[PDB]
Amino acid sequence: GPRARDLGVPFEGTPGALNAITDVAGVEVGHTTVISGDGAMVIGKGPYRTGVTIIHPLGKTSLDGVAAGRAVINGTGEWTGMHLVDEVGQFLGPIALTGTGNVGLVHQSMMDWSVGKVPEEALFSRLLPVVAETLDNRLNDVFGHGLTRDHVFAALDGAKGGPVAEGNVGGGTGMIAYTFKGGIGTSSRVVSAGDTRYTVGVLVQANHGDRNDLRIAGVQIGKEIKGAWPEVNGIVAAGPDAGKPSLLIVIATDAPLMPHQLERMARRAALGVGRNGSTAGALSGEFALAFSTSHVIPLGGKPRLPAIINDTDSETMNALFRGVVQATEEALVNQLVASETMTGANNAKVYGIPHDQLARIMKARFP
Amino acid sequence: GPRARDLGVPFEGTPGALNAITDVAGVEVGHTTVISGDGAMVIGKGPYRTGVTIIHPLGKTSLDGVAAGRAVINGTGEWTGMHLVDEVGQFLGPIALTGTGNVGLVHQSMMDWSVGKVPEEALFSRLLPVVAETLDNRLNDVFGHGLTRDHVFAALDGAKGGPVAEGNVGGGTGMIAYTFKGGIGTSSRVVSAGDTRYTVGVLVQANHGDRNDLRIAGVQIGKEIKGAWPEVNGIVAAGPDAGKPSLLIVIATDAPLMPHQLERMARRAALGVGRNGSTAGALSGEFALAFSTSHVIPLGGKPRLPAIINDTDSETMNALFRGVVQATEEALVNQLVASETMTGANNAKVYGIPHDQLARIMKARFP
Amino acid sequence: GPRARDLGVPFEGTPGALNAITDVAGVEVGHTTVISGDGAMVIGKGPYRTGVTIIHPLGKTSLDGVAAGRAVINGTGEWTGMHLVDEVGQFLGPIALTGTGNVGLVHQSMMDWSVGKVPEEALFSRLLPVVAETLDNRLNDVFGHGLTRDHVFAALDGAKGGPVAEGNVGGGTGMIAYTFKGGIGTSSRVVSAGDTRYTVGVLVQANHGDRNDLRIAGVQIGKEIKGAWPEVNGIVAAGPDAGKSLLIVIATDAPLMPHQLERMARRAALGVGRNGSTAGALSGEFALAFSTSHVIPLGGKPRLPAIINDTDSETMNALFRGVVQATEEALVNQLVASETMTGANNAKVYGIPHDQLARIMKARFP
Amino acid sequence: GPRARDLGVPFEGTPGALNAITDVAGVEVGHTTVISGDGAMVIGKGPYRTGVTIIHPLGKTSLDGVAAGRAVINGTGEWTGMHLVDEVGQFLGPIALTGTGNVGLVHQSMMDWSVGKVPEEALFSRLLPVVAETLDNRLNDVFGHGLTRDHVFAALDGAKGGPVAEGNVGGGTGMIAYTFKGGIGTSSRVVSAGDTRYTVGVLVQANHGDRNDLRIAGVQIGKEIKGAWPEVNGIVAAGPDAGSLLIVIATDAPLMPHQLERMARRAALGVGRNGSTAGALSGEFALAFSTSHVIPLGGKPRLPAIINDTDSETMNALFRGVVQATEEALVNQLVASETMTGANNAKVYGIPHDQLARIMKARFP
Ligand SMILES: CC1(C)S[C@@H]([C@@H](C=O)NC(=O)[C@H](N)c2ccccc2)N[C@H]1C(=O)O
Ligand SMILES: CC1(C)S[C@@H]([C@@H](C=O)NC(=O)[C@H](N)c2ccccc2)N[C@H]1C(=O)O
Ligand SMILES: CC1(C)S[C@@H]2[C@H](NC(=O)[C@H](N)c3ccccc3)C(=O)N2[C@H]1C(=O)O
Ligand SMILES: CC1(C)S[C@@H]2[C@H](NC(=O)[C@H](N)c3ccccc3)C(=O)N2[C@H]1C(=O)O
Ligand SMILES: CC1(C)S[C@@H]2[C@H](NC(=O)[C@H](N)c3ccccc3)C(=O)N2[C@H]1C(=O)O
Ligand SMILES: CC1(C)S[C@@H]2[C@H](NC(=O)[C@H](N)c3ccccc3)C(=O)N2[C@H]1C(=O)O
């Protein structure tokens, strides 16, 4: 289907070939999407609209660490492995993005997955898995154990490079963003740092923001779109006619950055988010994690840093920073466009942002 | 002169009466502006385009502390008294915003100022003054001692409530923002938290960003404006026709917030900055400090907290957060509009964003 | 069993009645201790030497939050709920301390425990459980699913005030500290803060440090102790004859704000420092402090019965000294409470010898 | 005179040749010590008991940056240049340690010092000087402008390697630690990291702690010492008869910035060994830097070797070095600082050498 650019939304900068986080060499992505049941929710019996998204920084067979740094916009949420990142500037294993109710199950499943796949002596390196959440409470039976260990194994083992599925998939399945359907979005930038061009890739799991704040390409678009407010049982449940008939950001780069430099990359995510108008609600867990696929730490070995960058080198750093801002901005709009209307638990209905209206608005604003 | 709204720039939200940080009860602002000399720079002899801006959270006569919390967007800069704020959640004395070369002089001057005004028993409370900088290196003889202790005393003693002077004044005098003239800007929002309305006021000293990134009301306006690039000696010095013929954000609120809650307010500034397009350059020291004028700590006494707010109360917190984002966004545009064209050290000429073109663009975009 | 003071170890300050975290009124502690199997390890079959320790800040029936703040000494470990604490200065629900392999199971079990006990409208408040770990890898089948949901429920439901069991129990069951047996330890201080008194309670799950660095009451005691090095099947496995993480929970009834509780938590490092360890590269050493008087009713107005000035040295120094001293003592109490244990792969770790310790203390403090 | 070891205080580990931060090659230290006036304080006239201590990480002629990271024990104090360090993991120029009242003067003086010495194109790199304080308020006329630009220039220009003067010198001149005389202290450790040796050097400016908490070599010694309490005009002013800390860590280990933060976070453990509990207004800070991981101005960073954070053999050796050198630097300070009378005739005693030596002899036969 069309992505944001295909509907005429302009963005600044040059995307990588896939315009996705997988433009960064090494990165694989996998989703398991769990959609079952309709109507009234009973805890433990669905409906389920949930899942898990896996990102392997160096592919699924890697036992090595990647240099990493994080940032917090608003920390009302969970992201495990982050004390490790703060302390030693790297993490081992995959990143899992999922629904809040699944964190514990995913965390233990990743440990289980390592058994028989990792040398015994190396197993202890698999004991701080990285698992993050947003809450799919409006569309999904959160507490009801809809996600199984097999679902997690399937995402771990099925992850791959190449085009990344966006929208109502994996961890984003039951999410809501800007009062429209939330989900997964991704984008990349190839940025010129003098005579070297690096790739910055971003994947988001979006469950944040309000329709009234939303900007797409700078256009405050909430009031321009007619209808498409959420419903319950065929009754408008939000907006002017109500009653009538968190954000996870994962940044990959092939730039050979040190961990403190990656924290800097992570802190740029907030500027990209800011472009699109949201203001970080009190309980919106908005977090960013950045890693390098060129600065790798072989397990029990010497760190591999193929080149080294000066933080005060504006030509290099600004190109990277702008890449993060732009790819984050675009990943967020790509999510909205990829996400289709869904009806879930308790008959809650949330519309995907209307393509026809969006394209019409973009054409009028950008003749 | 006209402020941003007067030129047809739309913003969301409701400003306070003055649309300035002084809409928050207790707050006084003072500037001393130093403009002397023209032509080639000789270190120690100008030209000078610098100054200092003072913000008294509770007025110039207060010996008490205000609850406070900070945030960093990019920390390549100086802001003293911040270890204190991080540790004990309050600061004593005024906030000074100035040029980088002035920090030491301002810091000692603020100590000198307390002598004779503050009981010898309370003097030690005046020994961690709050002084922050952006670099006026393109228009000002930074190292040349253009700022005097008397200049600092004048700003401390002359500060007042009511309308706040914007543009090329005080600490902002010699600054450059988005490749246009930088300086001081301010805005406020009155925000509804249930049956209680709070005030959020913001003042910025802006020296950040690139013209190519600039958004005003979502409009990427750099390429829409014709000319007005900086010059040297009548020769265009930047942009397409080149060669041819940091950010300090101060947030005040009357909301009775605890220090950790004010950190949250400070972290919202990045989103407001994000709206206007900048991407935080490698050497751009972009910082935010938030304080409450209702949560006051009498010197050596019991903290006064007139009411208490739950962090998980979205109705109250989201109103405050949106206030910070909107006031920050507008304060940044207000700065640009207030700042006039200036020629400074080494005949560097930086244009104020052209009012006529800006108004024309806003009219075409927002009929 | 004797605790540290009973063996003649001197400490500074005044302990509470129970000399435990439960000296802070309303705090409840529960353990489930899992000890089964012997001999060679088979992943998935044990031997198991693990468990879980639960701390209910306001008791097991509370749905309210407590003001909270944390500190990191060395962050190579997991402690969930901590982004929440950093952001909004409070956490809901119990603290669980456990073995690394159990984190996910405990996390989901805590959610399950809320279902049926918590009004449906309030359930979302139970979605960021606080769970922390140290690694019982030398005595326990870490990956082998030895801990069950029922074990977690039992600790949650069985938690109580009063005296706290120490040593090889709950989360500390399979741990190793200063090359001796690790485990759970607790201590408290009653402090004079201006013209009121407050209690500072500390509980530790200790799995950190090296014998050669250990100080007890300032005495570098590792070299003064004879034998008691770990073994594997009869063969001494460390020390001169070889081949022949730390979780700190601080409770107080002082009405502190979140940022002030961060300051409390940052004092733990000083008390840790007193006892000699130097925080190894992979030693996850963490502290979390909460107030039981500054409470946040769910969806309501925070309750702060009095307010303290950070610059009030009389009040704050007393509280800080309390943390340092209670931490120092909790660490030694752990060592003394922990008995010799043989576990997975016939690994054997000795409890610090009571007779030698008492002897050394007697000679050092006649 | 004697240092702590000379009075029979035992410590763990192996000190460098100088037992000082200057065991890290290329580091230079300079003090300017300002002692003048006696009797009653009149603000602006003294008595003065203050000064400044300069540490040049790569020597005074370096225009380059050093990789760096910091830690806070209790942040009630000032240390400039630290936002820079947190953000970009390096700092340019010298570290200055001084009295609280002097921070602004020192900060501007460091800028002035660069003019004429640094190419104009490079001057902007000199605009975030690193200046830290503790408060000499009981012995010194803090607000009275006792420190001059010339004093600062002298410490900057006079700094050198080799032995480092301790006690009542430079920034530590008017300080008070554990209710005894405070000041400057330094120590070092040479550590074995697998098949390589590194040096960890520590210098402190100590103005912290209470006598009742003090431990030296594990001995709670405040109560074993008789008298030596502070006085004001012949009248005991503390104790039964009453009728902040800056830690600089240098290493030649090629550590990245986040790794140096870990080093800095070890300082608290060494502080903890000596008993203090970090008072509410005690600004206790640590800064660590590498002299081998250097960043040529406007150039490519130079990292001669790289270390894995999970390499316990290498990291643990370094961490223990910080802890031990911090512990010893604190005791070296006390022993180096002599009894001093200052503003308002306040008198603060150096920890008594005779009593300390006897206590150590009794505890460690
Ligand atoms: C159907 C709904 C999604 S619309 C909603 C309505 C009624 O209270 N409130 C909102 O608009 C609310 N601000 C909101 C809407 C979307 C995402 C987050 C918050 N009721 C919901 C639902 O029942 O889950
Ligand atoms: C006159 C000038 C301001 S324009 C500039 C031109 C030539 O190199 N470069 C820039 O555009 C540069 N990106 C820039 C411009 C403004 C603010 C920050 C960076 N030369 C300057 C000057 O000499 O001070
Ligand atoms: C219902 C909400 C108040 S919480 C939810 C979401 N926040 C998260 O997902 C976050 N990680 C989180 C916070 C608290 C507990 C568990 C998880 C957000 O914001 N949503 C609100 C909404 O739908 O309006
Ligand atoms: C010339 C610059 C590289 S530094 C300057 C400004 N940055 C600051 O003001 C900041 N607080 C700072 C950083 C370093 C030393 C002293 C102060 C920024 O960015 N400017 C660049 C520009 O004009 O292009
Ligand atoms: C085997 C070790 C290298 S890891 C262990 C312990 N550290 C922890 O428990 C910590 N939370 C952790 C770190 C990494 C993965 C999982 C858990 C520590 O230190 N131990 C060493 C030892 O026994 O020698
Ligand atoms: C007089 C004190 C209350 S402040 C002082 C010292 N703390 C500092 O030096 C610190 N950097 C600082 C804190 C506040 C203002 C200025 C400087 C400390 O503790 N001293 C107390 C004491 O002597 O009793």
Side-chain angles (χ1 to χ4, degrees):
Chain A
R3 303 178 79 188
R5 287 166 185 264
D6 299 306
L7 298 182
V9 185
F11 304 94
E12 306 151 72
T14 300
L18 301 167
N19 186 21
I21 191 171
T22 49
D23 280 323
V24 176
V27 180
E28 299 184 327
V29 182
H31 301 296
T32 297
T33 300
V34 182
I35 294 171
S36 74
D38 274 294
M41 183 185 81
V42 168
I43 302 179
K45 306 181 183 185
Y48 301 108
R49 299 291 188 276
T50 197
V52 56
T53 293
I54 295 295
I55 301 165
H56 296 289
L58 298 175
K60 67 184 68 64
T61 66
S62 179
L63 296 190
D64 303 318
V66 285
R70 72 178 187 108
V72 175
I73 297 169
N74 185 253
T76 50
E78 196 48 71
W79 200 323
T80 62
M82 292 306 95
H83 311 308
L84 179 70
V85 168
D86 287 346
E87 184 65 49
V88 298
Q90 52 166 306
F91 66 90
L92 294 299
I95 299 158
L97 311 179
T98 192
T100 318
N102 309 331
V103 169
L105 181 275
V106 169
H107 197 275
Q108 187 168 38
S109 291
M110 293 170 64
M111 295 183 176
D112 290 348
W113 184 74
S114 297
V115 181
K117 291 189 193 59
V118 172
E120 183 178 2
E121 47 273 354
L123 277 178
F124 83 98
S125 77
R126 312 298 295 185
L127 283 171
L128 294 172
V130 175
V131 180
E133 60 73 31
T134 65
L135 181 60
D136 38 27
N137 63 304
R138 296 180 184 285
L139 294 167
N140 172 60
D141 179 11
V142 172
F143 283 85
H145 293 229
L147 195 78
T148 68
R149 173 172 54 182
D150 287 335
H151 288 148
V152 185
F153 285 177
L156 286 158
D157 291 333
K160 60 188 195 313
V164 177
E166 301 173 296
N168 304 336
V169 294
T173 298
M175 302 307 163
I176 294 170
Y178 306 96
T179 334
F180 291 105
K181 187 63 184 65
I184 297 303
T186 194
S187 185
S188 66
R189 289 297 183 279
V190 289
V191 305
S192 295
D195 262 322
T196 300
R197 193 169 297 123
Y198 290 116
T199 305
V200 177
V202 174
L203 179 150
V204 301
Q205 175 172 303
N207 191 49
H208 69 296
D210 291 328
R211 172 162 172 176
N212 300 138
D213 293 327
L214 170 64
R215 297 180 181 194
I216 295 181
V219 178
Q220 189 169 179
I221 198 162
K223 60 190 174 189
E224 304 304 316
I225 296 176
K226 64 174 182 294
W229 291 90
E231 298 166 8
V232 176
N233 224 281
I235 307 174
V236 174
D241 299 338
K244 300 184 181 180
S246 303
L247 173 59
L248 309 172
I249 308 169
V250 173
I251 301 155
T253 187
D254 56 11
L257 298 176
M258 291 174 268
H260 71 281
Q261 297 178 325
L262 288 152
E263 289 179 80
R264 310 191 72 196
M265 297 283 281
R267 288 189 287 264
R268 295 302 177 289
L271 298 172
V273 178
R275 290 186 170 192
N276 287 351
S278 67
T279 64
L283 292 170
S284 190
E286 303 182 16
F287 298 92
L289 172 68
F291 62 87
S292 172
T293 60
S294 57
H295 188 182
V296 171
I297 306 79
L299 193 61
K302 180 183 58 185
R304 293 200 280 112
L305 182 62
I308 189 161
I309 294 163
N310 189 333
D311 282 273
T312 66
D313 171 7
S314 297
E315 181 183 40
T316 297
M317 294 311 300
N318 293 7
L320 290 167
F321 290 158
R322 181 174 312 106
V324 175
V325 173
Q326 292 173 356
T328 298
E329 174 188 12
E330 179 171 354
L332 291 171
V333 185
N334 274 344
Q335 175 272 295
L336 289 169
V337 168
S339 285
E340 290 183 330
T341 295
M342 170 183 289
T343 302
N346 289 324
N347 297 313
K349 184 176 183 183
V350 184
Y351 288 89
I353 196 170
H355 288 190
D356 59 351
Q357 298 195 53
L358 173 58
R360 194 279 292 177
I361 296 167
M362 292 296 111
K363 187 185 181 182
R365 212 71 52 179
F366 305 108
Chain B
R3 305 181 77 191
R5 285 162 186 272
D6 306 298
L7 295 179
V9 183
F11 303 96
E12 306 149 81
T14 307
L18 305 166
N19 191 19
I21 191 167
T22 48
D23 280 324
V24 176
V27 178
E28 296 184 328
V29 180
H31 302 295
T32 295
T33 300
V34 179
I35 297 171
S36 70
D38 276 295
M41 182 179 87
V42 170
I43 299 177
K45 316 227 185 81
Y48 298 110
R49 301 291 188 275
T50 192
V52 56
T53 291
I54 295 297
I55 302 167
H56 295 289
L58 296 171
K60 65 181 69 61
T61 71
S62 174
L63 300 181
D64 304 319
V66 286
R70 71 179 186 112
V72 179
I73 294 174
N74 183 253
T76 54
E78 195 52 69
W79 199 323
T80 67
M82 292 307 97
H83 310 310
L84 180 69
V85 168
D86 288 342
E87 186 63 50
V88 296
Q90 55 168 303
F91 67 88
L92 290 299
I95 297 161
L97 309 179
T98 194
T100 318
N102 306 331
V103 169
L105 182 271
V106 169
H107 194 274
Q108 187 170 37
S109 297
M110 293 170 65
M111 295 183 178
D112 290 348
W113 186 72
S114 304
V115 180
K117 300 182 183 62
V118 178
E120 176 180 357
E121 62 210 328
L123 274 175
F124 80 102
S125 82
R126 315 294 298 181
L127 283 170
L128 294 170
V130 176
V131 184
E133 60 76 31
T134 64
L135 183 57
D136 39 26
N137 62 307
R138 303 188 180 273
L139 291 169
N140 174 58
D141 177 12
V142 174
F143 281 86
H145 287 49
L147 196 77
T148 70
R149 175 171 62 180
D150 283 344
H151 289 147
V152 181
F153 287 171
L156 290 159
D157 292 334
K160 54 176 161 48
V164 178
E166 298 172 301
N168 304 334
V169 295
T173 302
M175 304 304 162
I176 295 172
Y178 308 93
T179 328
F180 292 106
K181 184 66 183 69
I184 300 300
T186 194
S187 185
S188 70
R189 289 298 185 279
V190 290
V191 304
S192 298
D195 259 325
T196 299
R197 191 167 301 121
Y198 291 115
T199 303
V200 179
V202 174
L203 181 149
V204 300
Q205 175 175 304
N207 191 48
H208 69 297
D210 293 334
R211 174 164 168 172
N212 302 136
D213 294 323
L214 175 62
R215 296 178 181 193
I216 297 184
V219 180
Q220 188 174 182
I221 205 160
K223 57 184 171 188
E224 303 299 332
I225 290 168
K226 65 175 182 292
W229 293 90
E231 300 166 9
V232 177
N233 191 37
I235 304 173
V236 175
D241 297 339
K244 293 182 185 178
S246 307
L247 173 61
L248 310 171
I249 306 168
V250 175
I251 299 155
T253 186
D254 54 15
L257 300 173
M258 293 173 271
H260 73 281
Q261 298 177 147
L262 289 155
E263 290 180 74
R264 314 186 70 196
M265 298 283 279
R267 290 186 289 258
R268 296 305 176 288
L271 298 170
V273 177
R275 290 188 168 189
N276 290 345
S278 63
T279 60
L283 292 175
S284 194
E286 305 184 9
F287 298 96
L289 174 63
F291 63 88
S292 169
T293 58
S294 59
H295 186 183
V296 171
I297 309 81
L299 192 58
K302 190 191 67 62
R304 310 210 275 96
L305 178 63
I308 192 156
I309 294 162
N310 189 334
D311 280 274
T312 66
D313 169 11
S314 294
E315 185 182 33
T316 297
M317 296 308 299
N318 295 4
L320 290 167
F321 290 157
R322 181 178 318 107
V324 176
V325 171
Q326 294 172 354
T328 296
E329 171 189 16
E330 180 169 356
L332 289 166
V333 183
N334 272 347
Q335 175 275 296
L336 289 169
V337 169
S339 283
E340 295 178 336
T341 300
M342 173 182 287
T343 302
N346 290 320
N347 298 314
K349 179 177 187 179
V350 184
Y351 288 86
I353 199 170
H355 287 192
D356 61 346
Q357 297 193 53
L358 176 56
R360 178 255 306 181
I361 293 161
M362 290 295 110
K363 186 175 183 180
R365 169 71 181 91
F366 305 104
Chain C
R3 308 180 76 188
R5 285 169 187 265
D6 300 304
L7 297 182
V9 184
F11 299 99
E12 297 153 89
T14 300
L18 301 166
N19 191 17
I21 190 170
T22 47
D23 281 325
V24 181
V27 175
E28 297 180 336
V29 175
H31 302 296
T32 293
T33 300
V34 182
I35 296 170
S36 75
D38 308 270
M41 187 174 69
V42 176
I43 297 170
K45 304 294 157 57
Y48 300 110
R49 303 286 189 275
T50 195
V52 61
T53 293
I54 294 294
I55 300 167
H56 295 291
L58 299 177
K60 67 181 67 61
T61 65
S62 174
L63 298 175
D64 306 317
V66 289
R70 72 183 187 105
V72 176
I73 294 171
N74 183 255
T76 55
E78 201 47 71
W79 199 322
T80 68
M82 290 307 93
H83 309 316
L84 179 70
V85 165
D86 287 343
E87 183 66 48
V88 300
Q90 56 167 303
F91 67 92
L92 289 299
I95 298 159
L97 311 174
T98 195
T100 320
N102 306 332
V103 169
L105 181 278
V106 170
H107 199 275
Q108 183 167 41
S109 297
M110 291 170 71
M111 291 179 181
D112 289 350
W113 185 74
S114 296
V115 179
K117 293 190 192 61
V118 175
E120 182 173 353
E121 59 264 25
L123 276 174
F124 85 96
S125 76
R126 314 298 296 184
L127 284 169
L128 295 170
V130 175
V131 182
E133 59 76 30
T134 63
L135 182 57
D136 40 26
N137 61 316
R138 306 186 177 275
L139 293 168
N140 178 52
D141 178 11
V142 175
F143 283 85
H145 289 230
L147 192 76
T148 70
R149 175 172 64 178
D150 281 346
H151 289 144
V152 184
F153 288 172
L156 285 161
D157 289 336
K160 55 189 161 53
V164 178
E166 297 175 301
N168 303 335
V169 298
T173 299
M175 304 305 166
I176 296 179
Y178 308 95
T179 326
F180 293 104
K181 188 65 180 63
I184 298 306
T186 192
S187 183
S188 68
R189 287 299 183 280
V190 175
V191 311
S192 283
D195 199 327
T196 203
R197 305 211 167 157
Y198 296 119
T199 300
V200 176
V202 174
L203 180 148
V204 302
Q205 180 174 300
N207 192 53
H208 69 296
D210 291 323
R211 172 154 169 182
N212 290 331
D213 299 321
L214 175 60
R215 298 183 179 193
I216 292 174
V219 181
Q220 204 184 168
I221 202 165
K223 62 185 182 184
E224 303 295 331
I225 289 172
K226 151 61 187 161
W229 294 90
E231 302 165 1
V232 182
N233 272 111
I235 303 302
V236 175
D241 283 334
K244 298 184 178 184
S245 303
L246 171 58
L247 309 172
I248 306 173
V249 175
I250 299 151
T252 186
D253 52 9
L256 299 175
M257 289 173 271
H259 74 280
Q260 306 178 319
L261 289 151
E262 292 179 70
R263 314 184 70 197
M264 295 289 277
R266 285 187 291 262
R267 294 306 177 287
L270 299 172
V272 173
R274 287 185 171 193
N275 289 348
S277 62
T278 58
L282 293 174
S283 184
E285 304 179 14
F286 295 96
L288 174 65
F290 63 86
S291 171
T292 57
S293 59
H294 187 180
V295 308
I296 304 87
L298 194 61
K301 268 189 169 65
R303 292 178 185 169
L304 184 59
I307 187 158
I308 296 171
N309 187 335
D310 279 274
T311 66
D312 177 355
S313 288
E314 182 172 20
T315 294
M316 297 307 299
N317 295 8
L319 287 170
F320 293 153
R321 175 162 20 253
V323 173
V324 171
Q325 295 173 348
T327 298
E328 171 188 15
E329 182 171 354
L331 292 171
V332 187
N333 275 344
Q334 175 274 292
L335 284 170
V336 168
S338 284
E339 296 173 341
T340 298
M341 169 180 291
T342 299
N345 287 333
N346 291 328
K348 181 176 183 180
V349 178
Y350 289 91
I352 194 174
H354 288 193
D355 59 344
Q356 299 192 57
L357 175 56
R359 195 172 306 133
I360 293 159
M361 292 296 112
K362 193 176 178 181
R364 167 69 181 87
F365 304 104
Chain D
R3 305 182 78 186
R5 287 173 185 262
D6 297 306
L7 295 178
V9 186
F11 299 99
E12 307 154 68
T14 296
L18 295 155
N19 193 17
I21 190 172
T22 47
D23 280 322
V24 181
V27 178
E28 296 180 330
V29 180
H31 300 293
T32 296
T33 301
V34 174
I35 296 170
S36 74
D38 305 276
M41 180 171 84
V42 182
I43 298 182
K45 301 294 159 48
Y48 299 111
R49 303 291 191 270
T50 196
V52 57
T53 293
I54 293 299
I55 303 165
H56 297 285
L58 301 176
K60 74 183 63 63
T61 68
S62 176
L63 299 183
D64 304 321
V66 287
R70 77 186 181 106
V72 174
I73 294 170
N74 182 258
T76 53
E78 197 50 69
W79 200 321
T80 66
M82 294 304 98
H83 310 317
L84 181 66
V85 166
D86 286 341
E87 185 67 48
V88 299
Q90 55 165 305
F91 69 88
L92 293 297
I95 295 155
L97 311 180
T98 193
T100 319
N102 308 330
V103 166
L105 183 279
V106 173
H107 195 275
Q108 186 165 36
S109 295
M110 292 170 65
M111 293 179 179
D112 290 349
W113 184 74
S114 295
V115 177
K117 293 181 192 59
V118 173
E120 178 178 0
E121 60 272 14
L123 275 176
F124 84 99
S125 77
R126 313 300 294 185
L127 283 170
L128 295 172
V130 170
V131 184
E133 58 76 31
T134 66
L135 182 57
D136 40 26
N137 60 310
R138 303 188 176 275
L139 290 171
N140 176 60
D141 177 13
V142 173
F143 285 84
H145 290 230
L147 196 72
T148 71
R149 179 171 66 182
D150 282 351
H151 288 143
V152 182
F153 287 169
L156 284 161
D157 287 335
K160 53 180 161 47
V164 177
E166 298 173 300
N168 305 335
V169 297
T173 299
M175 307 299 168
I176 295 173
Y178 308 93
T179 329
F180 292 105
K181 185 64 182 69
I184 300 309
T186 191
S187 184
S188 72
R189 286 301 184 278
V190 176
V191 310
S192 298
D195 259 329
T196 313
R197 278 168 154 66
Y198 290 120
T199 301
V200 176
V202 176
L203 178 154
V204 302
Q205 180 173 298
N207 192 50
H208 70 297
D210 295 340
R211 173 163 168 173
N212 296 322
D213 297 323
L214 176 61
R215 295 182 181 193
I216 293 176
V219 181
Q220 190 181 170
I221 194 165
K223 61 187 177 186
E224 308 299 330
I225 291 173
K226 66 182 188 301
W229 293 93
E231 301 169 5
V232 183
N233 257 102
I235 302 171
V236 180
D241 304 18
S244 304
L245 173 55
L246 307 172
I247 304 173
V248 174
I249 299 156
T251 184
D252 55 7
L255 298 175
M256 288 173 277
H258 73 281
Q259 299 181 325
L260 293 155
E261 293 183 77
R262 314 182 71 196
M263 296 284 280
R265 283 189 292 263
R266 295 304 177 285
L269 297 173
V271 174
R273 287 185 173 192
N274 290 346
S276 62
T277 59
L281 287 173
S282 187
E284 302 181 16
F285 296 92
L287 176 63
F289 63 85
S290 174
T291 54
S292 59
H293 187 183
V294 305
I295 307 85
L297 193 60
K300 183 192 304 303
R302 301 201 304 247
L303 183 61
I306 187 156
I307 295 171
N308 190 335
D309 280 274
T310 67
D311 175 3
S312 287
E313 186 180 33
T314 299
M315 295 308 299
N316 288 9
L318 289 167
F319 290 159
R320 180 180 316 110
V322 174
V323 172
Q324 293 171 353
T326 295
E327 172 191 13
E328 182 171 354
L330 289 170
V331 186
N332 277 345
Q333 175 275 289
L334 285 168
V335 167
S337 292
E338 295 173 347
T339 296
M340 169 182 294
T341 305
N344 288 330
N345 291 324
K347 185 182 188 182
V348 180
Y349 289 87
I351 192 169
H353 289 192
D354 59 349
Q355 300 193 52
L356 177 54
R358 278 188 253 115
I359 297 164
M360 293 294 118
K361 190 179 181 183
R363 227 313 245 157
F364 308 101

